[PDB]
Amino acid sequence: GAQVSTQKTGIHYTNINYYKDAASNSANRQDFTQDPSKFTEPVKDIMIKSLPALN
Amino acid sequence: GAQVSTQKTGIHYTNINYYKDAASNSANRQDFTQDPSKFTEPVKDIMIKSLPALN
Amino acid sequence: ASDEYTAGGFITCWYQTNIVVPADAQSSCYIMCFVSACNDFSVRLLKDTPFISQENFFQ
Amino acid sequence: GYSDRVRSITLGNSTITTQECANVVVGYGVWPDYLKDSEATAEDQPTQPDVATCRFYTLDSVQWQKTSPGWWWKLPDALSNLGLFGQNMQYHYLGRTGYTIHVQCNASKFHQGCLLVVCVPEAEMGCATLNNTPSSAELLGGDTAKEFADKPVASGSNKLVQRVVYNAGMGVGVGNLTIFPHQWINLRTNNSATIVMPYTNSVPMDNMFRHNNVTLMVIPFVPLDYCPGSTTYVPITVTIAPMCAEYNGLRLAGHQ
Amino acid sequence: GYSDRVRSITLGNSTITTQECANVVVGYGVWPDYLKDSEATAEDQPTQPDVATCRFYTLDSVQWQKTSPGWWWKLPDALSNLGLFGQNMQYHYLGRTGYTIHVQCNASKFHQGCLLVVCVPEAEMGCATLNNTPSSAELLGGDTAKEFADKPVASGSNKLVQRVVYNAGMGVGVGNLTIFPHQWINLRTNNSATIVMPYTNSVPMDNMFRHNNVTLMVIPFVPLDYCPGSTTYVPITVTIAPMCAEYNGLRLAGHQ
Amino acid sequence: RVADTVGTGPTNSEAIPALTAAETGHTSQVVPSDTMQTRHVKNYHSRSESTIENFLCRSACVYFTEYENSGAKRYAEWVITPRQAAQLRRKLEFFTYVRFDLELTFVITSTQQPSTTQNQDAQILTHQIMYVPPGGPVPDKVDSYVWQTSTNPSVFWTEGNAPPRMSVPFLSIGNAYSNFYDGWSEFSRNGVYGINTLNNMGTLYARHVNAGSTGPIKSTIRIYFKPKHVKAWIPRPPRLCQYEKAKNVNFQPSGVTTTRQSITTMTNT
Amino acid sequence: RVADTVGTGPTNSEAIPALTAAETGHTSQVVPSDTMQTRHVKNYHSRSESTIENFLCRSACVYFTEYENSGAKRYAEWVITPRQAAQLRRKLEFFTYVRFDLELTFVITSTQQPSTTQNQDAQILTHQIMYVPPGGPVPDKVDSYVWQTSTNPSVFWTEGNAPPRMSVPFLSIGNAYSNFYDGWSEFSRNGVYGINTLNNMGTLYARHVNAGSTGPIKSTIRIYFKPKHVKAWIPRPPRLCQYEKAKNVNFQPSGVTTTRQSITTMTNT
Amino acid sequence: KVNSMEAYQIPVRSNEGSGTQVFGFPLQPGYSSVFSRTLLGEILNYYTHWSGSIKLTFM
Ligand SMILES: CCCCCCCCCCCCCCCC(=O)O
């Protein structure tokens, strides 16, 4: 029960785990998910770039 | 002849055994079976919660 | 183990209506308390009990 | 395996058990509920605390003696100081509630007696001195039972309530109090009395300090008795639980 | 017309009635039965006396006093001298049984007390003197109750069992004996305790003299009390009945 | 997993989930929902770490001895028992009968000893651990033919390597290991009383295959036991009194718990 | 990946991507294309190495102590905290709450000590590292029964081998580890103030299973922490002032930045 | 009384008033001297964390 995933490039690297605990697993280095509109733009009413902010 | 089972979480971990004796195998950590009505409630006649115990 | 962050609460008992007994029956009784866990009880992180000590290997 | 004698009432944090009782006497056949949009006047949205207000508040115990005439507790004023029922009651101009009144009194097989547990809607009481009206401190007793009198109260220049039990402090016949929802605690067969009062009033909501809509009265019709040896201290404990309490008109706290 | 309080147990010649009781506590949820061909080792055919062995043997009565610490009866050894159960037990190398233990104690409405009736599988007991092991005559009492001690037994150069009740003679907490099948004889609600023990052991059959697999213990947690006038002599009678007794390995009689 | 709480509201009936008769020998099954107004809560809590395998399956030191490079103590011997250590013994004794496989790990460690011996330049020490099942010939010296282990199992381990480990089956004659035994070994209700009548696992000998140096060296073998594939029957009260002997229940009486003052004191003293 | 620039040309409208009102508490999203003529560029640049896992997932030394062959310091103990080291503490403190698994690597190193002791010829040292969760019995000597670890987890490691390593779960009671705590431990708003009210991870003891030689030897255990499988919430300003305590925010005030001369000086001073 | 069966008895008596306190102990199943030696408290002492409801059956 292996898992072939991609390597970091600019191939694949097969992986199998041997331990019964998920804590015994390797780090999760390949999660490039992102969402800055929690911090950049946490405003209630939408702010459009091309429009005057205060109208 | 491997066996892919689940890891403890809040994945899988493949396992193969190499020894001819079952005593050489790993512990059985994932058996969460349970039956307290051997000790809690070992009474002959059934006792219903909402009813008076002695009637 | 104790920690005030992890404080639990207090269990108290009070007389609601004093103990009434007839004549010729004892006026001072006893009560017994039993402790069991409910169906939602669970314990975590295994360690050694502080309740069993040893100075030398028993013989 | 059942019994008409067993009971268990759960309201909020509190549960109440009985191993000897009569039915629960439900108000005027009415079980308490909230105010309808059809019957409402106050346009502001109510606070209905729920589990915080509608729960079992056990006031002080009182001693039943071979010579006790009776007792009375006004209703909004009794729980006026108890928990969050008393708080909401102070911050709000208007309030509305029903109750589950559980009067408890246990004796033994060698003891005898019989109490009338009534719920008198609008127990407007009289004064000892005919010209005056009793004082607020004479009619009311927060969580501390006010007691009836064995004999006529003297009409000086007071504002004393005319407590003689046989007239119930209302100028009526105490034996006719049986029209108001009630039960009896005959020590021979009973152990407690439970009365579920619905909201009785001519207005949908009223102020809880200015007006006490119901008055609980515990009057012993057949006196406590027992032969020597039989335990002498027989207390009576009153446990009341508000039911479907709403509060309209929020402002600063108090009454004035 | 029924009642959870009534009972009648018929085993052989004997019948047992109860007019006040709790359920029958069945061993570890297991009702006694015979040994299966799957679990058997001894190849010889067993003797299963039936009605002659599996019947109600009522041992000696013991007196519950305001100061009694408790009592204990080892199990195969108690009935080791009683009837045909004791006979088969002597002629046979191997034996296997379960029991229906009926502890009886009736007082009145003016009496109070509460006994713990347990069945301790393998009650290996300790010695007063730490270096020795108790004597066979100190641990065992055929049909005659062996009794616990009120206070610590002195550790001289004896082979006395360390009888202090609060440690149950096993170095444990007497209040945790509740894991072993049990019942209570609260004189207020009870009249007797019935426990149906299945065969508990790590081997399919064992010798009945060399090893006492279960130990019955009657330890009063809340002492006998009564006001003067209330009858003082309150006895406890123990009635045990073997269940599904088989015997393998016949030879001459005895133990040596 | 653990059970979730059900949303409860008020109640006014003759149903009494709270009143019972504890004399029945039956534990009540009341839950918060029965004596109060509960909210629905979803329990994801798991009782995984409290299974008997997780409780018992952890290496515990059960005993340890020493042997030397020279002198009298040149080889060691230990009659196998889990009762010499307070810690593991007490966990196993939560149950009357236990059945399991074992995992043996040994931590062998040596220490140079004080001597007037000059020019010491030790060579690597290799140790031999040998099991002598009940009945086989026993080593009477570091060099008796016995150490050939033609049939006895034995581990040869050179220092500096990973700890020697092997597993063992359920070696009992009974269908379960008996933790307690209320009986004797003789039919005349005499002889031994208690669990020792049952303990017959044999002995374990250890020795230095080589002396290694001119100076003195003393080694200490630590035996670790780890119950794998465990089955436990008939639970019992945990040990209250401290252990006095390794062969018997002998305890010295101690009080039920520690104390505090009044039954009203919210604090341990 | 990073966003590519769009080819832009001239503009002459009432659209103002550059003028805003920063009072809104909203960060502007202007890009080069908005205030100039841009060329199309294809960005293959990746923000892979700046993910929270890559930032935090690297072994950092969090603490280290020493124990000896002889004397008083024969075993060591450390109450677990990531706050004794400036480096790892500061990275974790970029977030208010963090949740993660841990990878523990220990680098145990020994040094021979100065003595008048003649004929030293050390034997290989084996060490034992033991974890005592909050509540368990603590070793009061190098030889208290406590070191049996019948239930406590512990690593036995012989010198010269690869560094002992094991991973640990998210051991918190809360649904996330709290890095900061603006509160007390007592409801009377008293007692402890701050994160220490929350730190209760237990202690870690280490010792020499064997002395090994006649001469003195002192060992130094270095504990390394590596947050695997990390989740971090509510980010905050990186620590400016230097750390003063390991249990509290206590800082000594320092200026906003370093200086230069005039607001016109293109160079740091 | 801890060295006796009295540790187990909760004294109840016929008073000259109600509202009196019968007993009082904190909610610390593994720590309080009351619960620490119970079946629940002994098991809890082998673990570091705990969660759940508890039943206190009074007889
Ligand atoms: C080199 C080979 C070593 C083999 C180790 C064998 C150890 C046997 C372990 C027996 C286990 C626990 C049993 C207690 C016995 C009893 O009291 O009945």
Ligand SMILES: CCCCCCCCCCCCCCCC(=O)O
């Ligand atoms: C040999 C076993 C060793 C086990 C190592 C256990 C170490 C626990 C680590 C806890 C991690 C970081 C937590 C900070 C705690 C807090 O402030 O809330």
Ligand SMILES: *C(=O)CCCCCCCCCCCCC
């Ligand atoms: C899925 O894994 C089936 C293919 C197995 C490939 C061989 C596995 C290599 C060794 C794994 C043993 C696991 C270690 C606990």
Ligand SMILES: *C(=O)CCCCCCCCCCCCC
């Ligand atoms: C089933 O196992 C077929 C797949 C085999 C995967 C490779 C096995 C890896 C090494 C195993 C040898 C067994 C050791 C005795």
